Amino acid sequence: HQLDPAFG
Amino acid sequence: DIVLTQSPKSMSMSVGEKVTLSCKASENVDTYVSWYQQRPEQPPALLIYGASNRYTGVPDRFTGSGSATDFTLTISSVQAEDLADYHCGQSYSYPLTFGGGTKLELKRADAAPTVSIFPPSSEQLTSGGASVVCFLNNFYPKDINVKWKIDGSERQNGVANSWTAQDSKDSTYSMSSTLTLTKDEYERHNSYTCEATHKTSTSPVVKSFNRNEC
Amino acid sequence: QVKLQQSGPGLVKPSQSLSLTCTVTGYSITSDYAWNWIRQFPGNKLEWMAYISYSGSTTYNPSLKSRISITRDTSKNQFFLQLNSVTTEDTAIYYCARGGTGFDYWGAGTTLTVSAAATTPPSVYPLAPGSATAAASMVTLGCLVKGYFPEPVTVTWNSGALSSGVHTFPAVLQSDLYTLSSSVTVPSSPWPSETVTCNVAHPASSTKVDKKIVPRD
């Protein structure tokens, strides 16, 4: 569950 | 918020060439640039993410690179199914942003436009309308400039232009230019000209008609 | 696998507010990822609007956070977008999308038209040649369709019999009504001698008109 900086 | 500029606005090339699209950022965005493809009347699909990583399903002729500021999408071998719009966006900073997009067209032999101008139909005039239409068909490249003249004068009011997207057969473009005025207006002038200036000719391509010509 | 589908009003009055639904299949919106909303304007320019993380957090693009809101229904596995005091600058195509590594999955997206116009039938007018312009072999006839709302118009020539040499252009806006034109270039063998009819159809207005291009006087 690796989301980019902008997400979450 | 960090602005993402896409240098190539419209890139024209042959099948089997080598296209490198550029995407620049305002500030550092590390490696968080993704590239999306968008065939007409279709939604964007992920192509490249993490600057380089190729998204599951993306053929090989697609490769990206770049580090926090200057990135590029390379298509080793261009195919007909690569003929589309390409977008790029960062996902590093809060307000996620995209660029203006880069349209990839097809290169073809130049072609002069076929101009046709029609006087308003009696059906419309009888209702008080007065529309003069002009068709600049099957021509290449995109760039052209139409201009209306009434009794030798330019006229900018009423002109509503329309351009079709590149043709998926002869790869040409097509435009219609319409001029609208009230019959009262239309009946005090007599010479109506549709003047065009394409790059396939040193002189303007003009179509015209005189109202007192049945 | 993952699947996203938008739905909602297709045409609204300005200043009104509304909600666009996004229903996803194949994945739980409480499981992971940020669930966004993106709109694309008439020019291909894309614009991020807002998202609702799987955890519940919400984030909005600063320039729209004054009039919008993202919400959800974990039960029915959907999320919605509400827009208020909408303006005409808001007509565009709206996409719901899942973000993680960039924008993963997108939906077909739905188009929204913000207009005050009322459904009104179009005016189909025949466009015969100006008597003098028609360079030999091929001749070009036209067909003007003005002042109709909403889209789309359907235009064919000779019930479909004609297909090659036809040019239909995108509908534009004259005031707040559309105008569209179509053309067909046929051999100078056909026309006067062979009837050509353009057929226009306006589903919305339930209108349907055939118009024959006859040589002018």
Whole-angstrom Cα distance, residue B161 to residue B133?
10
What CATH superfamily is the domain C117-215? Immunoglobulins (2.60.40.10)
Whole-angstrom Cα distance, residue B92 to residue B2?
10
Helices (H), chain B: 122-125, 183-186
Under DSSP, is residue B184 helix (H, G, I), strand (E, B) or coil?
helix
Distance from CA of C87 to the nearest CA of A (A): 28
Are the Cβ atoms of C169 and B175 closer than 8 angstroms? yes
Whole-angstrom Cα distance, residue B166 to residue B124?
31
Q: Which of C125, C134, C217 sits opposite B123 (nearest CB)?
A: C125
- Please list every residue in chain A whose beta carbon sits closer than 8 Å to the beta carbon of residue C105: none
- As assigned by CATH, the class of the B5-107 domain is mainly beta
B72–chain C Cβ distance below 8 A for any pair: no
Whole-angstrom Cα distance, residue C67 to residue C201?
37
Nearest to B25 by CA among B44, B6, B48: B6
Q: In whole angstroms, how far apart are CA C126 and each of B97, B115, C130, C199?
A: 46, 18, 12, 11
Q: Which of B95, B116, B123 sits opposite C61 (nearest CB)?
A: B95
Are the Cβ atoms of C53 and A7 closer than 8 angstroms? yes
Are the Cβ atoms of B114 and C140 closer than 8 angstroms? yes
What CATH superfamily is the domain C1-116? Immunoglobulins (2.60.40.10)
B92–chain A Cβ distance below 8 A for any pair: yes
What is the secondary structure of B26-74 as a DSSP string?
SS--TT-EEEEEE-TTS--EEEE-STT-B-TT--TTEEEEEETTEEEEE
Whole-angstrom Cα distance, residue B42 to residue B37?
9
Every domain range in chain B assigned CATH 2.60.40.10: 5-107, 108-211
- Please list every residue in chain B whose beta carbon sits closer than 8 Å to the beta carbon of residue A2: none
What are the domain boundaries of chain C? 1-116, 117-215
Whole-angstrom Cα distance, residue C137 to residue C189?
8
Handedness of CA C155, C93, C110, C115 (dihedral sign): negative
A5–chain B Cβ distance below 8 A for any pair: yes
Whole-angstrom Cα distance, residue C8 to residue B56?
31
Q: If one looks up domain B108-211 in CATH, what number appears? A: 2.60.40.10
C57–chain A Cβ distance below 8 A for any pair: yes
> Which residues, including other chains, have CB under 8 Å from residue C217's CB and lie 6 or more apart?
B214
CB C37 within 8 A of CB C57: no
Q: In whole angstroms, how far apart are CA C172 and each of C77, C150, C175?
A: 38, 12, 10
Beta bridge partners of B146: B196
Give this entry's resolution in angstroms: 2.5
Residue indicated by tokens 């209108």: C207
Q: Give chain C as a 3 state SS string.
A: CCEEEEECCCEECCCCCEEEEEEEECCCCCCCCEEEEEEECCCCCEEEEEEEECCCCEEECCCCCCCEEEEEECCCCEEEEEECCCCHHHCEEEEEEEEECEEEEECCCEEEEECCCCCECCEEEEECCCCCCCCCCEEEEEEEEEEEECCCCEEEEHHHCECCCEEECCCEEECCEEEEEEEEEEECCCCCCCCCEEEEEECCCCEEEEEECCCCC
Subunit partners of chain B (3 or more CB pairs within 8 A): A, C
The vertex-C74 CA angle with C73 and C75, nearest 5°, equals: 90
